[PDB]
Design a protein around this ligand. Sequence first.
Ligand SMILES: [Zn+2]
Ligand SMILES: [Zn+2]
Ligand SMILES: [Zn+2]
Ligand SMILES: [Zn+2]
Ligand SMILES: [Zn+2]
Ligand SMILES: [Zn+2]
Lengths: 431, 431
Amino acid sequence: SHMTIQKVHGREVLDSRGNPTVEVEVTTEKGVFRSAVPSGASTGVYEACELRDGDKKRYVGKGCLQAVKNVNEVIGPALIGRDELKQEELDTLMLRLDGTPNKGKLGANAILGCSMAISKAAAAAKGVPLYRYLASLAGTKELRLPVPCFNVINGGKHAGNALPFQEFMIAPVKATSFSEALRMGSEVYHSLRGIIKKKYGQDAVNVGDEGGFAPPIKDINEPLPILMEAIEEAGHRGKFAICMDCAASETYDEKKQQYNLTFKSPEPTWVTAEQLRETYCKWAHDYPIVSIEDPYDQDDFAGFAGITEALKGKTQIVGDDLTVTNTERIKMAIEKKACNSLLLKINQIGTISEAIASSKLCMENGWSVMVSHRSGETEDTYIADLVVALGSGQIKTGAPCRGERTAKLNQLLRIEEELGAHAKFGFPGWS
Amino acid sequence: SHMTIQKVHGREVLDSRGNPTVEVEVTTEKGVFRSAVPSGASTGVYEACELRDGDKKRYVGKGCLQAVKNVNEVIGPALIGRDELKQEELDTLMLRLDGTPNKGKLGANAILGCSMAISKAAAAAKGVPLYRYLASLAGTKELRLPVPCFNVINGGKHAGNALPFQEFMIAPVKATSFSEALRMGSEVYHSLRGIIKKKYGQDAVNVGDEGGFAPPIKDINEPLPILMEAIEEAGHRGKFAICMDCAASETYDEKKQQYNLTFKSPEPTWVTAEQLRETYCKWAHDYPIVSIEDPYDQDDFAGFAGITEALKGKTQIVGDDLTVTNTERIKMAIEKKACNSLLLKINQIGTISEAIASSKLCMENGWSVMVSHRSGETEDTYIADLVVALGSGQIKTGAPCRGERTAKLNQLLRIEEELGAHAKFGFPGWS
Ligand SMILES: [Zn+2]
Ligand SMILES: [Zn+2]
Ligand SMILES: [Zn+2]
Ligand SMILES: [Zn+2]
Ligand SMILES: [Zn+2]
Ligand SMILES: [Zn+2]
């Protein structure tokens, strides 16, 4: 008993957009283990329930007092005196405590903070770092430092610009260490700021939610030459690839079955799903585009399958809203050959055990896995340890700008230093 | 010996602008205590030396490898086996190890990380939280949660806009708890985003370095009505005051002795020092402006004294570049009655012992103290504990947006919860 969970407590804290979210502390004799839950803006319809208060008098209804009360009054009392090492057992207990398929009773945002903090308490009980403890839970044979995929130019749901597609990313795939990867990323980011300033003016270099630039660009093609120019100017020609997150559901209209690529402008631009495929095949030809995430709407399995086939061996197709880190949706995607990469978001499913199960299922069927932040982040660094623990070789956790992004990148520096010069870096298929 | 410093190690990590900075870990039998050093953009000429590498091939010369090497090869070996409780003794040792008045040999950015991490190791040795341990070092009789002063509209050195003066802040001075203060701040921030979007367009709501908006505004008066409108719209009429940071040295030309309030535009706007005082007296009359920081150039002691006298009892005048958290400059400011508030920046002076000495000297001479971040921050939360430990009742640590800002605000939530319902909140002179 002396080694078990002593206290569990949740509290409402602010995310990087200033919106409330949930943080949980699990206390054992080894210390206080604290985990915070991120929050999406472009959330898939199939994501686990993010439980908000709806009280217009607080945070215009975005409070997390109810989720916090669920931690303090329901989940925490159940956990006291339990063996924190029993991750699957305690995650399953929390699943059953909720009793609903979407975690709509307790909230995925109450459960997840507990699931995370348990695993950190357990790591401390074993006397190993989090990444080591998670690698044991996942059965990972080789740890690796991931290639960071940096969202440096944007165009989605609140960003401050006309740009319709969400993320234009640069990835230092030819770096030979994480230290080198991160420096090169920062250097290109800095070069890009100057390029944007000269082309669009001083007003154009303020940052989006994930620390990238949101220049006054409307057309989805326009960021790409600019990215190649920044890569060149920074002195890293040939070292970089591009990844896209289209978040294409956010532009899609169900009744018309077409995509609006000015949805943030007075006049609409209606474009079809093969007008899209045309664009994607062209992108992949014209630029070193190694990854395209959510190229289509979250239920367009046929669209996804079409582009996955057409770019096989050249450009991975990543499910995010399609798959929502959920073994059931992932099984549908496998059956239809809809995609070949999982965007892994612990808060899309709501427990560590389930997120690990999703990663294992995807890898066993030959997919890559890109561990991901949400557009609403905190100072939490869990995903840095998680990506190394899964050995997946791919992370997206922001531009190299804003503390809720750099905190993960910095944690990756710390892990890299612990693992030493023989630690593997990057994604072998891109190296 | 078993309770002493076991290991000291520094590493280069990224700040919230993606620039390298220094982090230090002090290891004792109680754990690993990690502190990171922030970095200014509008740095005073009298600040302690921030030592950079100047290697154009890394981070276009902004690397911190030399400062890190100074930690690893010089300072750390000196500290091994030492009693971490002896803050003054170890800070003094580091001062003497450097041997120069401006810390130009070892770097203030090598020394400070050590000074910070020592104090956290010592807090753990005593078995008290950091804020408690620092309050004992400072002789503070009453802890308090500070009023947060949120920089929500900007106009300085790289921001992305024409605005010449640096910070337009809102402070929930009539909040009765930190929890309430922080929520109200966030709610006004959200209201302000919508107001800016409607007035200036969707392109106008991307964020600056400290998470405030940088709308396409040129004139220094224009943000103020907008702030009052956001306060009203959020439902907090009467609960808020405004604080300014003019950073007026950044606009000042020495040879002409005048201020350029378009220095970021093609054409210049030359304005004198009494044209300024006119503006400040008007500001203080037209709006609830309770604080104006760096209203004049960093050596204009006469200008500072003039406005300090003219707004006595209504608007505190805060030295930042004038005083650089330095007892010698502070003595000059006292002698001349140049200001009546200290902007406390641990990295302007470079040791905890000296920063505490500055706070104590200012308070003993009747000044307020506003503990501050830098515009380049990290996920470090030291200043949250520091401000509570000094009992000063005033902090500026960003808009309620961006992880390197919200991490401090969140740490303040945690401290408030520990201290309970009877803990004092706010700055009595503003309440
Ligand atoms: Zn024990
Ligand atoms: Zn999304
Ligand atoms: Zn996505
Ligand atoms: Zn001992
Ligand atoms: Zn400054
Ligand atoms: Zn200042």
